[PDB]
């Protein structure tokens, strides 16, 4: 898995590849790893996927509830503090490793969270088996004050680094752009550089190929 | 990690490197290891990042509540809260914490709270894995009652040796100066401090 | 219909808690006790009624120490007072445990304040039948407080409670006026004996024993201490001499 | 310390009355009027802001509340009781439903969770009934638009239109006369405004009246783009201006 | 007054009285008299024991709490069994943990605070027994009086129970004399049996009827009954 | 382990269960009956860990007998087996799990058919014409796959068990001291007093 | 303290009745009549909605008839919100039983359980009892079509025809008069509605004032089916049986 | 030893044009020992089908849990659950047992009664959703199933063709797994009708 | 008896008498307070009365520093007041710790208003005899006044007053605002906003004050604090010149 987060002048971008692995096997060739904590706070996760899904949604729900209670837009610091305190309690047993990014009334934010509950702040970050490919890109080319356009390129290229070089990652690039002015833009499958080539043959079967013992109609109605 | 706090004539300075590693990998080359638990009480963290963050957050909560009820806490009080958490949860934490603070009655104070949760008040304190390399240097060069600039220099030289020999240390050198004047944040970059 | 007074946390239609008001009555019915703040400490004194020759003199101590630097004295139901002090002692230990420093007197006042207030919130408890005078020395001065059954408390220059509280107050006001820059721990001690002696006209029917304690930076090193032997006797003389 | 009131405070009197529920309905009776009207393409709920000081800032006190992107509530009776009911209803929408099925509850189910909280306050040890009646308006894919009333007892009933509080006998009569199965939301809004005017003493305008609707999806209120199956909330509070815009058409 | 305010220990009367406490106090006043007194070297308890029939035994009024401490009761006997049992434990704890004999004065504070808890909370009742505690500790001889109001008083001598006022006057008169009976256990006991006689309008103190206990300088708390009190009538 | 075999024929369910009880180095018993009647048409045989075995069976028996009295009615075999399955499935995630495997042989009076249920200690239940726990299937399934007919009388069922048991006594290293054989049919539960000489 | 405010909901009168139970039944007698009738080939449940208004959504409404299982239903008379509390737990119970046994819960077992829950509120706890009476219509393969009733005491009994709520004596008399053991379901629909129509306090019996259900063997199938009648269907059957 | 491998078994689901298919073998084993050939791993709750592979006791328990919850759901919602919702219900029920998990691989298949959309999904044993449109595989021959489906699958197959594809995918994957086979069953699922076919296969 | 007048259950007129009686208690101190909002500050003025000469005037206060940003003045008996104070302080610290930002004034008020709603509903807890006025310069909403009462009500205010002579001040401020047509005092400096408060207090009540007859709290961005006797004197002097 490759996930990055990149700060630019008026906001923050996150991106991620879309390969989901079980051991050496690609279980899903295009799962969405970009998760929404609230409209403008989004999240990418590596590690145990039941956990990143679960922790993202619990905190998301509590965030929604907090927001309603306080009549304020959710803050990235609140997502962070709740996530971290929850993970800390479970001592790294919840296998969640997250980049969490967003904009809220106080500005634009980028943080990472580790299973055990430690957090980091940065202008650029990566997590997952592609961390090091991705980081070779951000270390080479990150600079103070990128435009939105330069940031998408950078994020996107960092995921590509991992797609091509990390066996743990591949398929497509998902991006989400959170700009201080605006609505968050989720750009699912922003890049799809891995279309499977056409097969050499068709495997459609002559009907009646399969030996059948017994047929019967199943009862769905009442 | 290489962290230290040094009392001087007008108060206390905390300093630290900025490298956090997982094995050979530098997970973060610009960490802030100088953490605020009150306006003029700060700490340096070493050990598990998860534990020292959880601790500093709980300490900052306790001292904000203290302040509301009883006004400004002594540095010694901060040390004592830190210590209660560290000692009472010794089996489950790996936190090596230095606490540094400025008080008008007491001026600069420094308390070191090593692994098991014991407390020790000292004129200065070093800690973290980089520290082992500067016991000699530090013991030779520290004097009581230095000026701001002398103290800054002593930290700068000390940490840069620690950084030079300890693979777990590196990046920038951060300092927080605590006096009656207020709170000053310093940063020194490799290109300056490798030259020493 | 009424009955607003049968049950502890009930507001009367004019907004009063009658049970608290009745707890005050038990206080008013108690022995007089007082506190005087001097310019580096505090002095506590109390009237103990000698019901009979049979009471061992000096032995039934009424004044109590909390931590090492706090004195409390009270009038009313004595066991209630002890219970207040047991709580105060837990409360100061906890504070010291967590914060290393001994509890500041204002902090300590509120701890008693909250606990005593707590006992006006429910009908499953009764209010305290005491008023407590208490104080001591801390990182920034002497402090003297009095705390009513409602849980109301303030800082005082001098304070009095019990059967003789009117004479005591009037005496205390005289001091405040005739010494506007302060009084000393030594003067305060004597002055306390005097006031307790004057206060003793409303209980004129029985004999009494005087009990005094102080906490002063210069005279006791910020530690609470009972006034014993020579100083107690001197103080007694002063009051005896000044009664005529 | 410790609640030692573990017996019922609401019980049956010889005639079968539950006094406390009756008394709660009385408190509701004296509440400011509130109403709901259901149209073919939405629901509108309304009420008067009855500000308790002109020194108060009346927009810091909503009587109309979002419970989910597609469900809103209004009340008559004790405001502080309503407020905490709202907190509990938002929460229950998550713990009893969103965290289980990954979607928001349909209106009737949420209503029934609110109703149960209310029923329990009628029977549990040591509490009084909530002194409110709610009107809850909502939409969900499989039931369409609906409007529900929930009383202190915990009973709820579905309505085409209704009023509760102060002037509700007249308002319900006004509504029986104007309601039909063909109304469009703007028509309902209009009726709501007319019905409300009858109960309101002083100034009548976008600052003293509070109005929300459950209507179309407002994607411009979602906060993000790129997931085509999320079109955003159906609940929308009308603004002061939107309300005034409609009192010329009055 | 009374009427509406004596229903539980959680209610003050309008003059600030606690009626359930006074009613418990009242059960003491109707107990059989018992006297305590002490010199500098010993402390003595004497109690009049009541039977029920001439077919019944006389109910015991003295309970030993440790080697150096013990007490007498007047009022509800099972309440004394509770409180003395607690005192037994307090003594025991002090020895076990601090290797230290519990001071008679601490014992009084502990009893006061136990009693108090039953006068401020709902569903409790006060204790309805009064207690005289003698002991010999590191500061010598001691007599304490406990009232179920929680009031504990240290005295040279006292009596509690019906017609206790006799003994209380007698002792108040004897004071300067009985305080001096140092190193003569038998004299002090005889002084106590005299005190107790001031409280019999009643009848005559006999051998299955008198109970005496003693504690002091080289004397563990010990109880005499029967033929063992013959030499004092 | 012990021998626990069941066969369901036309009109009945037969259960066969070994008689030995060994504690380590000695056979302490050669007549142990590894069975509890749960209800007049329901039998349960069992094998596994030493005390758990009978504790579990007796606990099940108690519950079914309770239900029988409460309802004045005899639960169906399938109902009883589900109850038992749930109990074992609870037990597998408890502090100390019952290590017990069971066969349940019942004659369902409402359906007029016999039914045989195999449930291991995980609560893995299956309904089957024949079954076994432990190693017994490894020696007998191939004979049963061969001769088994669903139309068999009770008497054919016994001869087929006889054979199964003989293959066991030849190839299995432990002496299990023979089997006690019980039949469950429309008329209830009876023990074949002779499998020693039948 | 708290004692004073305790109504004591679970005590006997000197006549040996339970006050709260009797007061709750009083409350129930004011509720819409509910009728259930049992036949060889089915069960009818009919009930009167108390108070309507033309603005009430009859399409989305249920105040009287609730499904427990695919085979069990109840009619409610009393406090709706109380009935929902019970109905929800009864639904849980049916499923527990299904999960444990892999068989649908027999009607009695479900009825007894609910009645036991009711009885508890009568004997311990100090809570007001549930103001509910139920008619249970159900079917199982032990006893076929069964009809039961349970009230706030938690007593339950079985019936060939029964009413709860208002006017039950009038309803019971009518039912006793025209009910016959060999009655077929279609007859029972007629009887149930005729009975409601004669006993109402409403001016007449219109569709908008009724809830209605049958449990039949489904006509065409071989197995059991519950039909909760839509408002139109009630209008139809009201004409079929000549009440227009 | 590994709770997911004691019993054996496989499930695959596939989407086509206005249909889904879901298949499983019928084996239940006790490690090497084949125990039953009648152990169906697919279940339905109204129009939503759930296949479950893994430890058989958990298979059985989960089905009974899902029956229970979908029953209660219909009673309150007054409508049959949809696949998308059910999928979320499986997910949060599994995750509830995060540290004492059921040892299963579930697969959800069905058609959304309102939208008409064909839906399939998979989870791991603690409930992570595999959301993909084409096929979902689970169980002890899932390496093989992934192999079969990847080659054999094409989008928008007509039901009668999807049938051949899913059968062939299953049968040949099962024949390369020791712990799977001993019968197979295939559901072809359309908005209006659901057909169930048993497959003839080798019995070793 | 009249049981419905002793605990918080409904009277047959649907009233909670205990809550009404709790409002009465809020006036036992006979202190009036008022709060107004500046351009970027918030001011609370409260009367300070020290009847007894034996008191230490420095300890008689109804103004509390709740958090770095939030202040609270109470109208009601001191012990209830301090119970409210300690709780709000605890709530403000925990919020900060749980969610990583400072509790807003309005949200503290909602929270303490909710705690009050509960005393209104559970029999075993009495309401508190206090009205709480919370002030800050909230980071999102700017200068803020939120006031909670024994009923569990609260709302935001442009300005507000509380105590026995609440109305006189109330009508005075209403009059000021009818004229000025905006919802705040238009002054750049807190100093002037304190001056306006005292002035309008003097005009509403018809009294002069020495520096010891008032107590003053000021919220600004990132600080809430109270004025010394000397700070106040400087302000009394100022109003006196030009006037």
Curated annotation (Swiss-Prot), chain A:
Keywords from the UniProt entry = Cytoplasm, Hydrolase, Nucleus, Protease, Proteasome, Threonine protease, Zymogen
Q: Where is it mostly found?
A: cytoplasm
Report the top EC class in one word: hydrolase
GO cellular component, alphabetical, reads:
cytosol; nucleus; proteasome complex; proteasome core complex, beta-subunit complex; proteasome storage granule
Q: Which InterPro entries match?
A: Ntn_hydrolases_N (IPR029055), Pept_T1A_subB (IPR000243), Proteasome_bsu_C (IPR024689), Proteasome_bsu_CS (IPR016050), Proteasome_sua/b (IPR001353), Proteasome_suB-type (IPR023333)
Any one GO biological process: proteasome-mediated ubiquitin-dependent protein catabolic process
Q: What is its EC number?
A: 3.4.25.1
GO molecular-function annotation terms?
Answer: endopeptidase activity; threonine-type endopeptidase activity
Q: Report the locations given in the UniProt record.
A: Cytoplasm; Nucleus
Catalysed reactions listed for this entry: Cleavage of peptide bonds with very broad specificity
Q: Give the positions the UniProt entry annotates as the active site.
A: 1 (nucleophile)
Indicate the quaternary assembly.
The 26S proteasome consists of a 20S proteasome core and two 19S regulatory subunits. The 20S proteasome core is composed of 28 subunits that are arranged in four stacked rings, resulting in a barrel-shaped structure. The two end rings are each formed by seven alpha subunits, and the two central rings are each formed by seven beta subunits. The catalytic chamber with the active sites is on the inside of the barrel.
Q: Which family does it belong to?
A: Belongs to the peptidase T1B family.
* Further comment found in the protein's record: The side chain of Thr-1 acts as a nucleophile, and the N-terminal amino group acts as a proton acceptor. Present with 11400 molecules/cell in log phase SD medium.
From Swiss-Prot, chain D:
Any idea what job this protein has?
The proteasome degrades poly-ubiquitinated proteins in the cytoplasm and in the nucleus. It is essential for the regulated turnover of proteins and for the removal of misfolded proteins. The proteasome is a multicatalytic proteinase complex that is characterized by its ability to cleave peptides with Arg, Phe, Tyr, Leu, and Glu adjacent to the leaving group at neutral or slightly basic pH. It has an ATP-dependent proteolytic activity.
Its cellular-component GO annotations read: nucleus; proteasome complex; proteasome core complex, alpha-subunit complex; proteasome storage granule
Q: Any idea which UniProt keywords this protein has?
A: Cytoplasm, Isopeptide bond, Nucleus, Proteasome, Ubl conjugation
Q: Which compartments does it reside in?
A: Cytoplasm; Nucleus
Q: Which SUPFAM superfamilies match?
A: N-terminal nucleophile aminohydrolases (Ntn hydrolases) (SSF56235)
**Which sites are covalently linked via Glycyl lysine isopeptide (Lys-Gly) (interchain with G-Cter in ubiquitin)?**
108
Give me the gene this protein comes from: PRE8
One Pfam family this chain carries? Proteasome
Q: What else is known?
A: Present with 7060 molecules/cell in log phase SD medium.
Q: What is this protein called?
A: Proteasome subunit alpha type-2
- Supply the source organism for this entry: Saccharomyces cerevisiae (strain ATCC 204508 / S288c) (Baker's yeast)
Gene Ontology process terms (BP): proteasomal ubiquitin-independent protein catabolic process; proteasome-mediated ubiquitin-dependent protein catabolic process
UniProtKB/Swiss-Prot annotation, chain F:
Superkingdom, according to UniProt?
Answer: Eukaryota
* Positions where N-acetylmethionine occurs in the chain: 1
The keyword Membrane belongs to this UniProt entry's keyword annotation: no
A Gene Ontology cellular component where this protein is annotated is: endoplasmic reticulum membrane
- What does the record give under GO molecular function? endopeptidase activator activity
Post-translational modification Phosphoserine, affected residues: 76
Which family is this protein grouped under?
Answer: Belongs to the peptidase T1B family.
The misc remark on file is: Present with 21800 molecules/cell in log phase SD medium.
Summarize the subunit comment. Answer: The 26S proteasome consists of a 20S proteasome core and two 19S regulatory subunits. The 20S proteasome core is composed of 28 subunits that are arranged in four stacked rings, resulting in a barrel-shaped structure. The two end rings are each formed by seven alpha subunits, and the two central rings are each formed by seven beta subunits. The catalytic chamber with the active sites is on the inside of the barrel.
Q: What is this protein called?
A: Proteasome subunit beta type-4
UniProtKB/Swiss-Prot annotation, chain G:
Further comment found in the protein's record: Present with 17100 molecules/cell in log phase SD medium.
Q: Specify the protein name.
A: Proteasome subunit alpha type-3
Q: Name the GO terms of the biological process aspect.
A: proteasomal ubiquitin-independent protein catabolic process; proteasome core complex assembly; proteasome-mediated ubiquitin-dependent protein catabolic process
Query: What is the role of this chain?
Result: The proteasome degrades poly-ubiquitinated proteins in the cytoplasm and in the nucleus. It is essential for the regulated turnover of proteins and for the removal of misfolded proteins. The proteasome is a multicatalytic proteinase complex that is characterized by its ability to cleave peptides with Arg, Phe, Tyr, Leu, and Glu adjacent to the leaving group at neutral or slightly basic pH. It has an ATP-dependent proteolytic activity.
Transmembrane helix as a keyword? no
What does the entry list under GO cellular component? Answer: cytosol; nucleus; proteasome complex; proteasome core complex, alpha-subunit complex; proteasome storage granule
Query: Which keywords, in A-to-Z order, does the entry hold?
Result: Cytoplasm, Isopeptide bond, Nucleus, Proteasome, Ubl conjugation
* Biological source species: Saccharomyces cerevisiae (strain ATCC 204508 / S288c)
Query: What protein family does this chain belong to?
Result: Belongs to the peptidase T1A family.
Cross-link Glycyl lysine isopeptide (Lys-Gly) (interchain with G-Cter in ubiquitin): which residues? Answer: 99, 198, 230
Where does the record say this protein resides?
Answer: Cytoplasm; Nucleus
């Amino acid at each position: 898995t490759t996930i990055v987060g990149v700060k630019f002048n008026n906001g923050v971008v996150i991106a991620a590849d879309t390969r989901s692995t079980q051991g050496p096997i690609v279980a899903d060739k295009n799962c969405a790893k970009l998760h929404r904590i609230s409209p403008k706070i989004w999240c990418a996760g590596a590690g145990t996927a039941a956990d990143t899904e679960a922790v993202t949604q619990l905190i998301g729900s509590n965030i929604e509830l907090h927001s309603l209670y306080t009549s304020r837009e959710p803050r990235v610091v609140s997502a962070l503090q709740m996530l971290k305190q929850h993970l800390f309690k479970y001592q790294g047993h919840i296998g969640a490793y997250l980049i969490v990014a967003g904009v809220d009334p106080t500005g634009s934010h980028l943080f990472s969270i580790h299973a055990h509950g430690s957090t980091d702040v940065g202008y650029y970050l990566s997590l997952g088996s592609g961390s090091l490919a991705a980081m070779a890109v951000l270390e080479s080319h990150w600079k103070q004050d990128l435009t939105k356009e330069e940031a998408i390129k950078l994020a996107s290229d960092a995921i590509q680094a991992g797609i091509w070089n990390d066996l743990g990652s591949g398929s497509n690039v998902d991006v989400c752009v959170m700009e201080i002015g605006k609505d968050a833009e989720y750009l699912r499958n922003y890049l799809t550089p891995n279309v499977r080539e056409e097969k050499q043959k068709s495997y459609k079967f002559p009907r009646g190929t399969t030996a059948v013992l017994k047929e019967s109609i199943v009862n769905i109605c009442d | 990690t290489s962290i230290m706090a040094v009392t001087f004539k007008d108060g206390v300075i905390l300093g630290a490197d900025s490298r956090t590693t997982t094995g050979a990998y530098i997970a973060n080359r610009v960490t802030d290891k100088l953490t605020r638990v009150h306006d003029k009480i700060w700490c340096c963290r070493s050990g598990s990042a998860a534990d020292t963050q959880a601790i500093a957050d709980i300490v900052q909560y306790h001292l904000e509540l203290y302040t509301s009820q009883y006004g400004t806490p002594s540095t010694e009080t901060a040390a004592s809260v830190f210590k209660e958490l560290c000692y009472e949860n010794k089996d489950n934490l790996t936190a090596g914490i230095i606490v540094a603070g400025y008080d008008d009655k007491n001026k600069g104070e420094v308390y070191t709270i090593p692994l098991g949760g014991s407390v020790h008040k000292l004129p200065y304190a070093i800690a973290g894995s980089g520290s082992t390399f500067i016991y000699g240097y530090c013991d030779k060069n520290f004097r009581e009652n230095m000026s701001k600039e002398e103290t800054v220099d002593f930290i700068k030289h000390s940490l840069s040796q620690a950084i030079k020999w300890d693979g777990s240390s590196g990046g920038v050198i951060r300092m927080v100066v605590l006096t009656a004047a207020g709170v000053e944040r310093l940063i020194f970059y490799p290109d300056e401090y490798e030259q020493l | 219909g009424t009955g607003y007074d049968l049950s502890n946390s009930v507001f009367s239609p004019d907004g009063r808690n009658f049970q608290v008001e009745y707890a005050v009555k038990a206080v008013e019915n108690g022995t007089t006790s007082i506190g005087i703040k001097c310019n580096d400490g505090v002095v506590f004194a109390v009237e103990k009624l000698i019901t009979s020759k049979l009471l061992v003199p000096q032995k039934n101590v009424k004044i109590q120490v909390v931590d090492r630097h706090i004195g409390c004295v009270y009038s009313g139901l004595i066991p209630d007072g002890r219970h207040l002090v047991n709580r105060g002692r837990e409360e100061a230990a906890s504070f010291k445990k967590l914060y290393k420093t001994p509890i500041p007197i204002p902090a300590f006042a509120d701890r008693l304040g909250q606990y005593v207030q707590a006992h006006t919130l429910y009908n499953s408890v009764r209010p305290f039948g005491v008023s407590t005078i208490f104080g001591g020395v801390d990182k920034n001065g002497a402090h003297l407080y009095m705390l009513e059954p409602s849980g109301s408390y303030w800082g005082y220059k001098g304070a009095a409670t019990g059967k003789g509280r009117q004479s005591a107050k009037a005496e205390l006001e005289k001091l405040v006026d005739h010494h506007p820059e302060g009084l000393s721990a030594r003067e305060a001690v004597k002055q306390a004996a005097k006031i307790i002696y004057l206060a003793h006209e409303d209980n004129k029917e029985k004999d009494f024993e005087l009990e005094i304690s102080w906490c002063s930076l210069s005279e006791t090193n910020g530690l609470h201490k009972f006034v014993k032997g020579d100083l107690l006797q001197e103080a007694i003389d002063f009051a005896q001499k000044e009664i005529n | 310390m410790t609640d030692r009131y573990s017996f019922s405070l609401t019980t049956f009197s010889p005639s079968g009355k539950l006094g406390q529920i009756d008394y709660a309905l009385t408190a509701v009776k004296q509440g400011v009027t509130s109403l709901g009207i259901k149209a073919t393409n939405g629901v509108v709920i309304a009420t008067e802001k009855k500000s308790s000081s002109p020194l108060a800032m009346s927009e810091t006190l909503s009587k109309v509340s979002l419970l989910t992107p597609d469900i809103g509530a209004v009340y008559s009776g004790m405001g502080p009781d309503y407020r905490v009911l709202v907190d509990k209803s938002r929460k229950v929408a998550h713990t009893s439903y969103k965290r289980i099925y990954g979607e928001y509850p349909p209106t009737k189910l949420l209503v029934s969770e609110v109703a149960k909280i209310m029923q329990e306050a009628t029977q549990s040890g040591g509490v009084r009934p909530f002194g409110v009646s709610l009107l809850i308006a909502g939409h969900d894919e499989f039931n369409g638009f609906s409007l529900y009333q929930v009383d202190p007892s915990g009973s709820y009933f579905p309505w085409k239109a209704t009023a509760i509080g102060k002037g509700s006998v007249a308002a319900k009569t006004f509504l029986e006369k104007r309601w039909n199965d063909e109304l469009e939301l703007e028509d309902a809004i209009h009726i709501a405004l007319l019905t409300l005017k009858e109960s309101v003493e002083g100034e009548f305008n976008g600052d003293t009246i509070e109005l929300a609707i459950i209507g179309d999806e407002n994607p411009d209120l979602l906060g993000y783009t790129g997931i085509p199956t999320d079109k955003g909330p159906r609940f929308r509070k009308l603004t002061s201006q939107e309300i005034n815009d409609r009192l010329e058409a009055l | 007054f009374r009427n509406n305010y004596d229903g539980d220990t959680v209610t003050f009367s309008p003059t600030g009285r606690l009626f359930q406490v006074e009613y418990a106090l009242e059960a003491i006043k109707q107990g059989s008299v018992t006297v305590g007194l002490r010199s500098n070297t010993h402390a003595v308890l004497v109690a009049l024991k009541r039977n029920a029939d001439e077919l019944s035994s006389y109910q015991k009024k003295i309970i030993k709490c440790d080697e150096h401490m013990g007490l007498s009761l007047a009022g509800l006997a099972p309440d004394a069994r509770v409180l003395s049992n607690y005192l037994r434990q307090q003594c025991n704890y002090s020895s076990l943990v601090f290797n230290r004999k519990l001071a008679v004065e601490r014992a009084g504070h502990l009893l006061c605070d136990k009693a108090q808890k039953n006068t401020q909370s709902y569903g409790g009742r006060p204790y309805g027994v009064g207690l005289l505690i003698i002991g010999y500790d590191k500061s010598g001889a001691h007599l304490l009086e406990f009232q179920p109001s929680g009031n504990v008083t240290e005295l040279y001598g006292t009596a509690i129970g019906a017609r206790s006022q006799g003994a209380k006057t007698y002792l108040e008169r004897t004071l300067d004399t009985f305080i001096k009976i140092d190193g003569n256990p038998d004299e002090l006991i005889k002084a106590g049996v005299e005190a107790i006689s001031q409280s019999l309008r009643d009848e005559s103190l006999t051998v299955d009827n008198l109970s005496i206990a003693i504690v002091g300088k080289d004397t563990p708390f010990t109880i005499y009954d029967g033929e063992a009190v013959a030499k004092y009538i | 382990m012990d021998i626990i075999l069941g066969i369901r024929v036309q009109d009945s369910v037969i259960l066969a269960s070994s008689k030995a009880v060994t504690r380590g180095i000695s056979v302490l018993k050669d007549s142990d009956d590894k069975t509890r009647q749960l209800s007049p048409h329901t039998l349960m045989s069992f094998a596994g860990e030493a005390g758990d075995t009978v504790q579990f069976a007796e606990y099940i028996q108690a519950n079914i007998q309770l239900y029988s009295i409460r309802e004045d009615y005899e639960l169906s075999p399938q109902a009883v087996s589900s109850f038992v399955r749930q109990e074992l499935a609870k037990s597998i995630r408890s502090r100390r799990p019952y290590q017990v495997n069971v066969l349940i042989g019942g004659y369902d009076k409402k359906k007029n058919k016999p039914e045989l249920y195999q449930i291991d200690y995980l609560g893995t239940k299956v309904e089957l014409p024949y079954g076994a726990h432990g190693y017994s299937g490894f020696y007998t399934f191939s004979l049963l796959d061969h001769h088994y007919r669903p139309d068999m009388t009770t008497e054919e069922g016994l001869d087929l068990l006889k054979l199964c048991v003989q293959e066991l006594e030849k190839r299995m290293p432990m002496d299990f001291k023979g089997v006690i054989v019980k039949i469950v049919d429309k008329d209830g539960i009876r023990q074949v007093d002779d499998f020693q000489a039948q | 303290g708290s004692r004073r405010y305790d109504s004591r909901t679970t005590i006997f009168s000197p006549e040996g009745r339970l006050y709260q139970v009797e007061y709750a039944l009083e409350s129930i007698s004011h509720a819409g009549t509910a009728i259930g009738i049992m036949a060889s080939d089915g069960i009818v449940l009919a009930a009167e909605r108390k108070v309507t208004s033309t603005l009430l959504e009859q399409d989305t409404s249920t105040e009287k008839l609730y499904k427990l299982n695919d085979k069990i239903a109840v009619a409610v008379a009393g406090l709706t919100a109380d009935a929902e509390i019970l109905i929800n737990t009864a639904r849980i119970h049916a499923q527990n039983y299904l999960k444990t046994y892999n068989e649908d819960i027999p009607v009695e077992i479900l009825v007894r359980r609910l009645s036991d829950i009711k009885q508890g509120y009568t004997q311990h706890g100090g809570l007001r009892p549930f103001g509910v009476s139920f008619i249970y219509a159900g079917y199982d393969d032990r006893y076929g079509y069964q009809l039961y009733t349970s009230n706030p005491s938690g007593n339950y009994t079985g019936w060939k025809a029964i009413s709860v709520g208002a006017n039950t004596s009038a309803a019971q008399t009518l039912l006793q008069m025209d009910y016959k053991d060999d009655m077929k379901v279609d007859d029972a629909i007629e009887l149930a509605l005729k009975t409601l129509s004669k006993t109402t306090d409403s001016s007449a019996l219109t569709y908008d004032r009724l809830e209605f259900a049958t449990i039949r063997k489904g006509a065409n199938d071989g197995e059991v089916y519950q039909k909760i009648f839509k408002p139109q269907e009630i209008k139809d059957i009201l004409v079929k049986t000549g009440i227009t | 030893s590994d709770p997911s491998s004691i019993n054996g078994g496989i499930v695959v689901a596939m989407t086509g044009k206005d249909c889904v298919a879901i298949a499983c073998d019928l084996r239940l084993g006790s490690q090497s020992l084949g125990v039953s050939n009648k152990f169906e791993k697919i279940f339905h709750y109204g129009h939503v089908f759930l296949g479950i592979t893994g430890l058989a006791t958990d298979v059985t328990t989960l089905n009974e849990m899902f029956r229970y919850k979908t029953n209660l759901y219909k009673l309150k919602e007054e409508r049959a659950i949809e696949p998308e919702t059910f999928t979320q219900l499986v997910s949060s029920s599994l995750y509830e047992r995060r540290f004492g998990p059921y040892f299963v691989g579930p697969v959800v298949a069905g058609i959304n009664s309102k939208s008409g959309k064909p839906f399939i999904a998979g989870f791991d044993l603690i409930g992570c959703i595999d959301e993909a449109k084409d096929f979902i595989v689970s169980g002890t021959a899932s390496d093989q199933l992934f192999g079969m489906c990847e080659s054999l699958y094409e989008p928008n197959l007509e039901p009668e063709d999807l049938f051949e594809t899913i059968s062939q995918a299953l049968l040949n994957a099962a024949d390369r797994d020791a712990l799977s086979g001993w019968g197979a069953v295939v559901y072809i699922i359309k908005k209006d009708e659901v057909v169930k076919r048993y497959l003839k296969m080798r019995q070793d | 008896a009249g049981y419905d007048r002793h605990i918080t259950i409904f009277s047959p007129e649907g009233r909670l008498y205990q809550v009404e009686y709790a409002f009465k208690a809020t006036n036992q101190t006979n202190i009036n307070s008022l709060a107004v909002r500046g351009k970027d500050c918030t001011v609370v003025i409260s009367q300070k009365k020290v009847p007894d000469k034996l008191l230490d005037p420095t300890t008689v206060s109804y103004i509390f520093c709740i958090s770095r940003t939030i202040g609270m003045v109470v109208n009601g008996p001191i012990p209830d007041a301090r119970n409210a104070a300690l709780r709000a302080k605890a709530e403000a610290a925990e919020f900060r710790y749980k969610y990583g930002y400072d509790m807003p004034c309005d949200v503290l008020a909602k929270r303490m208003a909710n705690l009050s709603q509960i005393y209104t509903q559970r029999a075993y807890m009495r309401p508190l005899g206090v009205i709480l006025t919370f002030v800050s310069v909230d980071e999102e909403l700017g200068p803020s006044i939120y006031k909670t009462d024994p009923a569990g009500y609260y709302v935001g205010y442009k300005a507000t007053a509380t105590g026995p002579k609440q109305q006189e001040i109330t009508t005075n401020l209403e009059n000021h605002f009818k004229k000025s047509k905006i919802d705040h005092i238009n002054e750049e400096s807190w100093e002037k906003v304190v001056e306006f408060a005292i002035t309008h207090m003097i005009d509403a009540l018809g009294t002069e004050f020495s520096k010891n007859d008032l107590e003053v709290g000021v919220a600004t961005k990132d600080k809430f604090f109270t004025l010394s006797a000397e700070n106040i004197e400087e302000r009394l002097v100022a109003i006196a010149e030009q006037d």
